[PDB]
Amino acid sequence: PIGDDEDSHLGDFIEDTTLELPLDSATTESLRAATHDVLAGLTAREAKVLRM
Amino acid sequence: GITKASLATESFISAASFQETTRVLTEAAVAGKRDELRGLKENVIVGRLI
Amino acid sequence: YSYTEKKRIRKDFGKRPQVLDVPYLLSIQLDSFQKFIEQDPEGQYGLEAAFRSVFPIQSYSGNSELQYVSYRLGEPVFDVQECQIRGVTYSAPLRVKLRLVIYEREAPEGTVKDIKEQEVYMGEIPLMTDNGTFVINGTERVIVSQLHRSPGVFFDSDKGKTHSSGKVLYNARIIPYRGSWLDFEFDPKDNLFVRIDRRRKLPATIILRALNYTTEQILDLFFEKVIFEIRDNKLQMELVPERLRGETASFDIEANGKVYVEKGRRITARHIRQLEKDDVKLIEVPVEYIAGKVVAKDYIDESTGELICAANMELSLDLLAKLSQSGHKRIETLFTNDLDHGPYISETLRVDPTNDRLSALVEIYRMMRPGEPPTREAAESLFENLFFSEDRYDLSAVGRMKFNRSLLREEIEGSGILSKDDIIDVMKKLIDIRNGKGEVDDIDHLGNRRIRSVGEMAENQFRVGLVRVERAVKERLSLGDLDTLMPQDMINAKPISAAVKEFFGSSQLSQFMDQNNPLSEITHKRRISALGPGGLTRERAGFEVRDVHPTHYGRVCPIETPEGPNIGLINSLSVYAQTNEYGFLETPYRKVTDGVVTDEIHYLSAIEEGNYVIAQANSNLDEEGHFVEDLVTCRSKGESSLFSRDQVDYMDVSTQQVVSVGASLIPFLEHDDANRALMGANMQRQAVPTLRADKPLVGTGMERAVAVDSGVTAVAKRGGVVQYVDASRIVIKVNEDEMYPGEAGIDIYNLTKYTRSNQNTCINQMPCVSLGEPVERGDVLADGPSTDLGELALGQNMRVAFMPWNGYNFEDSILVSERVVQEDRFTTIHIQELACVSRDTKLGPEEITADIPNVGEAALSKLDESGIVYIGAEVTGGDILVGKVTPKGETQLTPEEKLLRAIFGEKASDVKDSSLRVPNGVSGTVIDVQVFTRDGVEKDKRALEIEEMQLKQAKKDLSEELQILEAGLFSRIRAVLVAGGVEAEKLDKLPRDRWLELGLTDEEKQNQLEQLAEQYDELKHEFEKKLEAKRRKITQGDDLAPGVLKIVKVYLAVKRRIQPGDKMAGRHGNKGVISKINPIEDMPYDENGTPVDIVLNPLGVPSRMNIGQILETHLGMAAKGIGDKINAMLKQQQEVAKLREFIQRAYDLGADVRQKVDLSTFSDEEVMRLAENLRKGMPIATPVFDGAKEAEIKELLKLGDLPTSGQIRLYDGRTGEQFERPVTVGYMYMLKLNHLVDDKMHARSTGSYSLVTQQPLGGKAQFGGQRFGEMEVWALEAYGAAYTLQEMLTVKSDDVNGRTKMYKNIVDGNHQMEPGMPESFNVLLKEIRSLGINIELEDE
Amino acid sequence: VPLDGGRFATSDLNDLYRRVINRNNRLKRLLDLAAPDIIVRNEKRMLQEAVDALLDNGRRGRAITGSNKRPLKSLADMIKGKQGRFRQNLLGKRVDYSGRSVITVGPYLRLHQCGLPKKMALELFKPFIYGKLELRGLATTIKAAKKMVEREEAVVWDILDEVIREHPVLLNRAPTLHRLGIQAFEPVLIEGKAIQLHPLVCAAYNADFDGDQMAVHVPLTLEAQLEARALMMSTNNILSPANGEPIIVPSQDVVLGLYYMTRDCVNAKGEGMVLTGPKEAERLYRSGLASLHARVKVRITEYEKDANGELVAKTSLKDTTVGRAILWMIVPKGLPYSIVNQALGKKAISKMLNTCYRILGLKPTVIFADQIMYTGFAYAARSGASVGIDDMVIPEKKHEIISEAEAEVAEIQEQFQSGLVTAGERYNKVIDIWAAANDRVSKAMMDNLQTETVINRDGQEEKQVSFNSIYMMADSGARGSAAQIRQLAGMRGLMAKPDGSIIETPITANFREGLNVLQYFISTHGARKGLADTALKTANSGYLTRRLVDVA
Amino acid sequence: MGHIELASPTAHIWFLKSLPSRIGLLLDMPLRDIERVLYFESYVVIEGGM
Ligand SMILES: [Mg+2]
Structure with missing residues (x-):
């Protein structure tokens, strides 16, 4: 988890760089x-x- | 009641979208139950017209 | 008054003479961390307490023991500014003298073979700054004080709710400071029960049988013994008459001739008192009364040893006939009753399975570690290590104090561990509470609430580190060799530093300082949180913790808490409140004698408050301290009531002690509803510092304490004459009497210029004193952000009209004239810190070269030859600040693109533009560039240029330090040589070197010359060595992340003005969004012609019950009316007698007040600067609950030429004709909150997508996407909209083919969607399918 | 996948499958070496635990991850719950072509249109602008179109004004409870960075402008444009789905402008003169010869639907005011005159819009609601209706009633010290006499506000309803009612302690007077209980809505 | 997708630990005895004749 313990975890920030x-x-x-x-x-x- | 008449349904995705999920998927997996998409929850789920 | 106090003296209403001034507003942080790190000679709280508690470490009976001597903290390697630049903790090392001993053979008291005593490093601990702030990883962090349950003993009820029987239960609880808990509780049928944790319910008396107690002395301790003697016959009963209270007898009790107690009659206490007077001890009962009694001890036959009856057994006639034939006429029974003495322990023994000590220990060891078979000695060591070991169980001094206090003991000190008397007395007290005497407690009561602080929590994490290392030291000293090591190889400093850095770096109690306002700093340091470790959470608790208890009066502010998810769990500490020795809250009161209120003050805690009765702050008393009535409003025990004139014990100190520092700066707080006052004091933190500072006309007098006693302004430590004023530094010449004899010097204050605050605002210091000015000790010299002349100026004061103006102020909206934005009086300054890292990939390293593929030369003209932007070039969105390219390869080109390459021969380059760019849609100036480079890598040209710049800056600055400091020192030397051997004109010709070695008479003057000479030479050598140290700190490399070459940081300074969409707010909680920014031509203007600047809405004022904004508006009009009259009398060049007369009349003005003034000021030089400081408007202080009433506002308006009703007729700017019903105009102090619109606004056409589910990830400036959540999908289902929903959750969001098909169809201008299937549903199929569950899609 | 910095993010399913594969290989290796039975029974229990932790962790001892105390995330953790795929990525998705900014008023709009910033309109409508630029040949390829809209050249703003013109956007506030939370509008481009939102619409959103920010979505395809115009345009939703009442009811400034405009004082300029119609009513008010409100005989012509959809005209001299005649120009043809002949508070204007919709259909009601909003804001500006400190009249009978009640509680105090009564009947008598004193104070302050204006015409005196500012703001129904007016002028109530018990000593001071420390400290508890209850009731109302939609 | 050949077989937790337990009331056997069999604490006869 990133801060303030929300539903925001680290997985929701990782961008996809394999698309065009x-x-x-x-x-x-x-x-x-x-x-x-x-x-x-x-x-x-x-x-x-x-x-x- | 509304938390029990909504899960006792002939369409298990509308019974699995909000409430207790594990019991619904196992109850519909032992039964071989078939869902005919029947009523706007499944169609929002599966991404077609309403 | 002092020197800046007479610069612009604030008019002060209020009728209570303040007798205790406002204390140092940060005393919690600094006093706590002074208790933490300090050489305490005793077992006082601190690091010494943790070391003396956890040491000595001894081996596993191998006669090798490690013990303690002392500690020391070294000075930090890096000062605070360089520490914030670099990113390390502002920490200090921890040197500890340890002593290792080893014993010899068959001499435990004997002489050791050797001692080994040396210093050892154990981790770095961070130091607090001078303001209460820590620095952990580049940022400036505050640890919030925690609130929790006091360790001790709590007797709770938990009424009603168990099994709905209507019965109340009772549970006692022993809460340690460190260890396992303890619980005692009843059940719905009167059986006592123990719990060693929140584990399973165990019968109670087994813990008594775990403390080596048989049934005999258990029933002896918990019951009184009724003695049945058989006086020759008939089985008589010994009597104490008090035992018969409230009872009904089944027969006639007769004593000394007369039948007193009749059969079937309830016994009145008249019978009891007659039995007392008749000398009644032993009376005669039948054999039938013993049918209900229970035997106390074991009764047996003497010779045969057979059991007549074991202990705790009821007595039938058979047992009586058995005890008659053995010969025993002594019978011991247990006294029972349904009201007074309940037989609870006997019932609990009848429930209990076990009998002896060993089965009790077996039951506990089976009931704590279940499933495994028990063992005797393991169970003995377990029950040793639950409550009676010095290691795993500890009540502090506070724990033992509350544990003795709630049991009504005598001593307030004792051991940390428990004892048999402790647990037995707690069980006795619980049975007494169940029997109707005594009372339960409540956890909201602030006598049962301990406030932790920074020193205590850091001490406890340090103790965690010490036990985590003493496990390893016990492991090593058990295998310990004789002489192979100095005693540092045993200890690892990874766990200690790891634990303390883990606490300061990551906790719910250690967070970024809100640093956009001096108020916000000074109220984030004064915060009382109930969250975090060892405290309740938002999900689990709870309503009574959120609520305000009547013991919060004067200890915790009730009207400041963050409205939202956690209301009341984030309380704030009141103004005058301190922290007790034992950690509790305590508040000041004035001691009252017989009738005279004495100025001596006593700090009272909460449980000491309830005994006394405390008077009212809002009372009236003459000079002799007598109350003016014969009856006065008071509070006795949480109850407001009117008591007599001399029954009072304490008076409140001042009118302001019930609120915080955040709420007390709201004037007219006694005229607002507590909802909007909560919102106002909640949002008074969030003001952005404006470009000027502009003196709140309606202040509360608490502004100077928040200005000075925070850390933003520069307070003079020694007063004198100001020698030098620059924007960079202020140089003070200290007076002779305030100067030390040795180390003479003068003072120098390096101001902090434009730099980055944590909330991206610009914290800045500006000088407010001029050259050659007398200053007092403790007087302000440099105003910080949002401070004017040592006051607190959070925002600016503006002319306000309350009228509906063409609907632009519709719901809550504010409407501002262009006269505000033309004046730049809300234009704020933000500083952003953009960063460009340059790592090393496995395809190649990155470069910071200026050459960029496929950009224009006009895009690169703002760069240098080195590829890093110049200082001071105004950039917009999209400009290139750090030209950085990353190497790539293996292009994998297509068809006809490969055809095109072949046609035109252009090489697809081996590199990619990943340069640092300005974010989308800001502007501003590059003001500061830093280049951090790993040592061993080539520094480029601008890195060496910045190094030469900082090297010349440091050397010039330290040379100016030494030069102006020795200029003060030689100016002292000249003052020395004139007394006793003057050279008037001879001295200044011969050089400064030959002043230190000129002869003079042997007196204190020659010793003075020797002192000043050695201080000169010491400062020269100190200058040289610290210049070399500063150069080796600058020139050396910098620690970086593992595998990053170099980091270029660029600081932008954006200057954001105002626009529709910003938020503004007065101090009363009237929020509003600026809606239209009108020209000056359209504003309502009165008959003098002055256009109003902000037109609010009146409709918010009856609904939201904050009427105090109207009173603040009227008194602001009064203040600016006095200012305009003074400005007129100064523009006409009236003589200073007329100004003296008018300012005298303005400062007298009202009822009996606290504001005596001039004439004591100077003739011109102080009065004319006061009138220069009052021409913008004469300020008014209103102390919070006591200040200015209506009639004083009317009498102040009559001093001005303004109307008494406070409502001017106004003329519309457009039609030019008068508004009917003249409107309220005035001067409201309003604030620009930092919810600026350009930080909030964004949009997304098509950006990035999340990896695991192909959806656009939400955020900013990650381009986000407004989450069309579940309720909005229900909303589109509720319409007939179905194509909207089909594109809303398939094509616009999820489908990997569909979004590109849609983008092609849109740029072709053919609005059409090819829907397909969402991708995350395919993910759901693979997730259910990756269980054992088959899910498919079917045929047609 | 690689983060920036050579350090990776794994999902915890990699840990789970690694543990399962590891223990399966261990069990194959043990059955190769013919292990004793204790060891393989240990290993089969461990493989059971590994599989059962992979399928749904949390129904065992909660096998935690490595270098962390936090429990890891299994498969049923990814299906089930608030963060599962059913509720985070299937029923509600984050959507492209959206934006978000702070909302503001802009009263110059018809209600089929809202403001929208130029910068948001350029960022949202990028592929539309790309399409029109490569159609019109200003950009040869599409990369040139990217650089043209990046540099923001002066030719793209006419293109953007072409692509906006008839293209509805969807405005959305985040607590979207009922179906009026998403409505379409037609954008008017704004020099600014804040969405301008039409005022009459805001009562549908439960949106005040105190900093709340809204979201715009864009119907891309053609069917969605026709859905947002035919079903979700703001002029279609002027009736609630909960009842037939209008949801585009005029809210606060406009009803104050009306209640000031249609009223009558007994003496004003042009008292009792005669007027030929509404037009010279406007010429008299805007020249300043006659006042806004004075009782006046005018000639008005009202139409009605007497025959079958036919507008029968009847004309007469109605005895009315000037301001009512000025508002009469805004009423459409069908309505009778009696809809504007009363005082027109909030209830009356809701009945006005309801009758106009139930008679003339949709189009005159939409344009009539826009004209009501315009004239309400304009004559509220001309009203100068301003609150002040003299606008809250304190009764002279206040402290007298408080002194009488203070003597009566001393009477009951002496009757309890005489042992005549018990505690509970004492308590009930004291709370009844304080409520009686509060009711006497309320009936004092209402009669001291509402009829306080007494003036003269051709005679001695005459009383009327008051032109107090706060009385207009309470009588019009704009903001607040007589409970809050009571708490500003008379004594405020009887506060309740955290027991739910209620204190025998009420707050005998309003906000116009000061409150001392103990009274304000007692009031703080009611305020904080109110805030905590609003938060918790918000959460429970959300849960109730969710169960009700998922049953139906 | 992939697969793992499990060497010894393994009870599926969803058909074992949800409250209407399916292996539980499919064999008509209490759940504590089933967990007692699956954790190798006891035995169970499998059609062992009569
Ligand atoms: Mg809001």
């Missing part, structure tokens, strides 16, 4: 969208090779 922030997920979504739109602008072989 949702803003990073928004960047990843927008980056996949932008890269798909840009690789659409290439030729067939160049886009196929660059995806492969």
Whole structure:
């Protein structure tokens, strides 16, 4: 227990550092969208090779 | 009474959410009791619509 | 008056001449810890008591014994300022001289083979500061005095509640100071019972059979013997006539010719007195009266030895015929009665199974350690070690005093352990209480309540450490060699220091000092808690402990306790109350003679109060001490009643002794309800120190005691002429008569500048005296926080109008003009301490370099070349104070991010910005930067810069110490050489070195020159060695946590002004939140044109019965009216005779008072500075229950030009037209409480989540989240809201996929939720499933 | 998991499974070595204890943890109780998109809207602002949107005003007992850091503004916005669920402004003149020719619902006051004039809102409650209703009645010293005569307050109800009643000792006079008993609510 | 999730120590005798013939 003996124990303060922030997920979504739109602008072989 | 008509219930999560928990889970574990979510306590518990 | 007393003298109402002034308000702490650490030559309380009690340690009969000599405490390594900077305990070592002896063969009295006597270290104990504060781990902590049950003997009733029979029980109890308890109690059918603990109910008399007692002498001690003699026939009865009281006989009792007692008649005491006068000893009864008696002792046949009857057996006619044939005519029976002498012990013997001593000890040893078979000698040693061993059982001197007092003994000293007479007398007293005589006690009574303090609790934890180490010393000395060791290898200083540091570091009684107000310090040191170890808890107790008992009068304040979970368990110690020798409370009273009240005072405790009858403080007496009536209100035994003129024993000292220091600074406290007075004195602690200090116009006269006798201001210890005034230091030249002959010098007072208090406010000292001013001894020189001229200025006084002003003051709200915030008269100063640690990870160490990945140069322009922010750069939220980067690796990049990296070639760096940043939404100035570095690590450039800064500061400061100190010393030398051999113009040309060695006549003057010379040389050498010591303290490394490289601490000083949302409060408990901060143009203004500053609400005043805020408002208007008249008479340049006349009329003004004044002051120089100090408003003292009434306020308002009714017509600022029904304006002293809004306000979009259950963890500034608890879920169920609840406890909170799906859908602008399943329900399934219980989800 | 500093936090289940695995390996190792029977029976008892401590610690000798005296936490400790998953993490969860700050008044609001700070509105509505900025192209990517709302550029405040406009937030006070504790509002942005909360709503919350702080939640999805508008907007809840009484009853300043506005003194400016309607009543009061309250014949036109939902108009000269005519502009069409022709205390204004709701439906009652609150605060400001020290008239008959009672207790004292009576009948007679003296003091002070104003018009004299400040604040029902007015002016009661017995010597001093030390010391016990009882009754009422909702 | 192969079997405390004891009134046997069997203080016959 941290002080004043409340229901506050040490377990309710430990943050999770293994998650990713949702803003990073928004960047990843927008980056996949932008890269798909840009690789659409290439030729067939160049886009196929660059995806492969 | 209200502390006894609430635990004598055909839905054990509403009988296990507030009062004596151990007796309710063992009484519903020896009985194989089936809970049909029946009435807003379980649906707040299980996180769906009310 | 003294010198600052005549600087701004406060007008004082009140009619009682104070005869005992207010004592030193911190005497509990300092006097207790003076009892703790002091070389006591005797067994007085202290460390000497603990050592002389637990020592000598002897071996396991191996003739090797360790005994005690003395102790000593070394001086601390670190002074208090460096100790608060570094983080260690402010402690002192504990050197102890111990002596080890070893004996020889077959000589227990003989000569030892050797003695070994040396000093040994046993732990550090913390020292108290000069103010009552300890420092444990960097912070400044206070140990609160504890209240508990006095050790002794308590006779409680516990009426009614057992089995609902209507019968009362009785239980006696022996409560030791250290050991096992003892209980005696009855049952619903009249059987006595013992308890050695709260363990199982045992029959009572077995403990008597545990003390080597047979049935004979048990019945002898608890009963009186009725003798049946057979005088030749008929089995007669010996008679004492008093034995027949209240009784009814079954036959005719006849004595000396006449039948006095008739058959079937109750016996009147007239019969008893006639039997006394008729010389009646032995009378004749039939054989039928012995049918109910019980035999006392064992009756047998002589020759055969067969048992006629054993002890405690009722007598039938068969037993009578058996005792007739053996020949015995002596019969001993037990005298019984239903009222006077109850046969309780006989019944308890008939319940008891055992007979002898051994089966009694077997029963106790089986009934304390159950399940194991007993053993004789183990049971003997057990019952030795329960109540009769000097080790495991102890009543102190207080225990033995109460144990003798409640048994009506004679001596008040004795052994700590019990004895047979003790337990038998307690059982006798319990049977006497059951038999109707005597009374029970009550635990609320403060004669049965002991107040512990810091010295006693530290002593007891020190004794815990000493027994924990003497186990190891008995283990070592049993295996002890002859000569291989000095006697320090036996003892470990880990448990002693561990125990005392565990007590001061972690307890419910040792807590952070509330340090945001001088009142808050001085009332946190004066606190009487009932919680903690050895005391009740909030869950278990209880209502009578919360309630106020009539013996709290003048000992414990009734109107100050924290309203909330623990009401009344956190009591506060009254103003005049002290602590008795035996630890109890005691309060001062004035001794009353025949009719004359003598000024001598007697401190009376609680159980000594009830015998006398005590007069009233609010009484009226002439100069001859006679009461003006013939009857006066008093209290005899908790009962207010009107008694005669000369039956009184003691008078109360003053009008103020019933309250605390927190409550007595509420003026007009006799005009408020106790609810709002409780809230007012509860919140008068929490004022933030404002930027100025502004002199409460309505004071109570207790302000100077709280100002001086706390620790914030700088009180002069020796008066003189002020030589030098700076903001840093004040340098006093001491007068000649107050100066010591040796160590001449002058005084220097280093003020504490802007620094951090524990509640983040800024404790500061500022000089209030000027250059070249006479000062008295004990006179204030430097005002602290919230202090003006040695008064207590918790807040500021403002013009108040009580009117509803367009609803902005709706419930309790306050509304403030812009004239307050433009003046910065509530702008407070906070200091925060941000910290940046730099550890060593297993991926690499962290750096404090200035180069940060992916930030702008404009974000780093506020940094130096070393990466730590400059002193004095105003930062906002988000600025970088300590540039710190942590090494990372193994990025694990994705698809098209890896594509992008390939396209643009930018290296994902091997490091991460984890810099220290300003918290979200503050501002302010970086005022102090510290760099703590582990020794053996490269110090960077700014660390060496701070070291050179502190080194030059310390060397310059100590050189100024030595220079100004020797300037005073050479100014004394010149005063010496003029008397007896003057060089008027010759001396100042020849150098200071050749003053110490100039010749002069052999007198006291040459000895004086030798003294001053050796003091000069000693201060030079002392300067040199302590400069080297200060340099080696600064330059060396610093202890840190295991595995942290360096810590950079940065102190921000925020300047927070005021805004809607703050809280303000007067001293009467009128809380309020500032709602709108209007411009000056919109305020109500009267016909002179002065805009009111705060418009309160009148509707709180009839409801909440605190009418005293109105009287304080009117008298504030009176005070500022006198101030405005003085300001007008000073602006017109009236001569000093006119000001003298007007101030004279202002200070006379009223009934018979206690405030004689000038003309004794100086012609101009004291009067004009007094008028300069009164132009802001003439203050008024109102001593608490005795002070200013209404008619004196009216007569003071008539001195001003103000209306008598106290209500001015006012004009609205907007419409410009008059308010109907003229309103109350005045000057209320109001306080800014530290519930500021910007500490309270936050919000969260999406932050962190808790680990074990994927929910946003609550707190600040952990970004929290307003907990939508169980009742709010019921509230949304109560509406038709169901989608709100579904997102409220799945998507916004718990679901690990759902929150990111929601965030994507929101930033795409598509409001839609994909609910899924909560995560914590999946945790619940894994927790029930990780039992033996199968729980599943089903098919469709 | 690692804390910062190389030191770990384990849960105590790791200790429990470590002990169980340890003793299981020990028992396998013992049965390998063919141990004697005492040792393996010891080990099977130990494994029983280890498993039974893992499943539910506390039904044995409470096996404590290492380097600590505190008992550890098993599985049933994590399911069962106040801190279990059923009551700490399933039935009530901590929620994102929430905020918390100190509340304050702001009387310039209609009751469908509350204040909300700009900084909280920027922190709560961050993903909405992100979405609108990447829609409007001011931020090319979303990281640019993060840095734009971080630097707080001047373009984001128009964006935030677009995302607020019709989006209800939920306001919540922490003791959320009945279902009016969570209500929706529409935010108006505030230069400040304190939530402005509409005044008429506060009686629903049991929220005074003495520092209590409230919490806002944000309906994210579209259905929750429509729920908070259709079901939980503040204009929907103007009736309690406990009874049909209005819960948006005007509370304290507004009822004082009304009770000052609709009253009549026998002589004022414009006494008994004639008025063509409410409009020149307002022109007479606001020019200062005629007073606010003077009895006056006016011409008013009242409508009624005589036919089937039809507004039949009738016009007449009512004999009323000026201020009643000024309030008549605020009454909607449907109500009769007799709703404003009386004095309008708190009960009367609750009946006014109740009749307006039961006749004209919801919309005129909402806009009528807002107009009542505005005119109440405005004419309370014009009232200048101010408490003062002369406002509490002490009866001249006070000390005379106290002296008579002091002689009567001396009579009963002589009758007890004469052995004529016992103790209990003495006690009962003394408490009856002190209660009789207290009742005489109450009937003295009420007649010395309420009719004390005596003035003249076209004749000698005439008495009326008083314009004392404290009498208006007690008669209007704003704050307090005659018990507290009694304790301010007459003697205060008969206090009870901690026995529950009641003292024969009552407190013969009010608060306008001083109280000496013994009287105040006796009063302190009643105050502290009151505080302790309020705390304990709060706890028991919470438990009663919880059992009642969980049975139903 | 994981598992532990317990070597000797072990009574489940929830079916042993809750007040309506299930092993208690399933075998129709008083609980102190059941704890006396489980703590190896006594014996109990297990269908030992007649
Ligand atoms: Mg409140």
